[PDB]
Design a protein around this ligand. Structure first.
Ligand SMILES: Nc1nc2c(ncn2[C@@H]2O[C@H](COP(=O)(O)OP(=O)(O)O)[C@@H](O)[C@H]2O)c(=O)[nH]1
Ligand SMILES: [Cl-]
Ligand SMILES: [Cl-]
Length: 246
């Protein structure tokens, strides 16, 4: 009866459009088929990260909320025109294993560029529901409400992405997953972030557990940021060639 919906995506992905279309950093609600929907439009971010460099306070707030804000579902709004760039965050959302839908927006611009994308198999690799849309189109957004409501009542079925970082990094992950098994979010996902040196995860930790984590970042023989960038990029690129066709 009362659902919390987070809107998350890159800047210029269409978030504010789809938020305004549904409801009538911005907050709002609507009703559909006898249930209530509290919507939140989180600021545009490109990764689930904050901290010293990621100066913008807005980005930290978005990162923090995705990490900790209550949510029945996170709507990942993805600009279908720059598909590969946007999907990097999508991967990280998937590693959180929070309930989530991908919304390919700006589909109108894509079909006038003679690009057809295999949303069926795109769904197969992300392992979460994938929806196509043009948020400026009133009819499709209303159709989107019915689709979203149905999913929330039916429950969202998720299979986790086959994302593998190589034996060493995988070992460091399974070393740190212990101290995250209680959290609302995948211990693996938080373990990966801790090796990635995410201020949000790390500062949450006990003084002891904090000095565990960076003991592992010295253990790693390759640059952690170099490894995750390559692995996610490779995965992304293979997927795009499989799903994008002309
Ligand atoms: N062609 C096309 N343009 C869109 C669509 N949705 C949004 N836009 C445009 O892309 C820009 C996105 O703005 P906005 O919704 O604020 O993106 P935000 O930065 O994520 O909040 C706006 O100028 C929109 O008019 C769409 O489905 N198709
Ligand atoms: Cl209910
Ligand atoms: Cl692309």
């Amino acid at each position: 009866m009362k659902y919390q919906v987070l809107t998350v995506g890159n800047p210029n992905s269409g978030k504010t459009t789809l938020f305004n279309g549904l409801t009538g950093k911005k907050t709002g609600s609507f009703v559909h088929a006898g249930d209530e929907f509290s919507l939140t439009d989180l600021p545009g971010i490109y990764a689930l990260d904050s901290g010293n460099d990621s100066n913008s306070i807005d980005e930290s707030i978005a990162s923090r909320a995705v990490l900790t804000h209550p949510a029945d579902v996170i709507i990942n709004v993805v600009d279908a025109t720059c598909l590969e760039r946007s999907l990097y965050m999508t991967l990280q959302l998937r590693e959180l294993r929070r309930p989530m839908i991908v919304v390919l927006n700006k589909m109108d611009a894509l079909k006038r560029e003679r690009v057809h994308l295999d949303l069926k198999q795109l769904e197969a690799f992300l392992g979460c529901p994938v929806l196509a849309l043009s948020a400026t189109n009133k009819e499709q957004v209303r159709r989107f409400k019915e689709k979203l409501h149905k999913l929330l009542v039916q429950g969202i079925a998720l299979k986790q992405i086959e994302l593998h970082y190589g034996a060493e990094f995988e070992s460091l992950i399974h070393e740190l997953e212990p101290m995250f098994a209680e959290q609302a979010v995948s211990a693996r996902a938080l373990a990966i972030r801790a090796l990635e040196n995410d201020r949000l995860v790390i500062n949450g930790l006990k003084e002891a557990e904090r000095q565990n984590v960076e003991q592992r970042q010295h253990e790693c023989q390759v640059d952690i940021d170099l490894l995750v960038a390559n692995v996610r990029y490779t995965y992304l690129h293979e997927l795009c060639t499989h799903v994008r066709r002309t």
